[PDB]
Design a protein around this ligand. Structure first.
Ligand code: BDF
Ligand code: BDF
Length: 91
């Protein structure tokens, strides 16, 4: 709880960058697409965050893993807004 905790992903050649910050129990998103940093649409509960992303042709897919206690919730971006993913784990 001494400092915020971040996770970062990027794609393409511009590039696009997404940086997720866990702070005081919530995870927010800052975005770069070549022109300046702006606040993204992702905001969900969590004390810890990790991220991965992959391209399928021209489509970006992002997975954000948000954890509180022993429960990790996966959030998915597949072109049409964030949706909850199927990830589970018994921690
Ligand atoms: O505005 C850019 C945006 O749509 O890019 C994809 C995701 O990173 C979203 O949370 C974000 O708002
Ligand atoms: O399209 C969503 C989904 O199927 O993508 C692959 C994995 O991230 C799954 O947990 C997730 O539900």
């Amino acid at each position: 709880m001494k400092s915020v905790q971040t996770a970062a992903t990027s794609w393409g050649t511009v590039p696009s960058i997404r940086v997720y910050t866990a702070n005081n129990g919530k995870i927010t998103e800052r975005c770069w697409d070549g022109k300046g940093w702006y606040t993204g649409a992702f905001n969900e509960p969590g004390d810890n965050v990790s991220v991965t992303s992959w391209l399928v042709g021209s489509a970006i897919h992002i997975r954000v893993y948000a954890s509180t206690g022993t429960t990790t919730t996966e959030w998915c971006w597949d072109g049409n807004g964030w949706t909850k993913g199927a990830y589970t784990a018994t921690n």
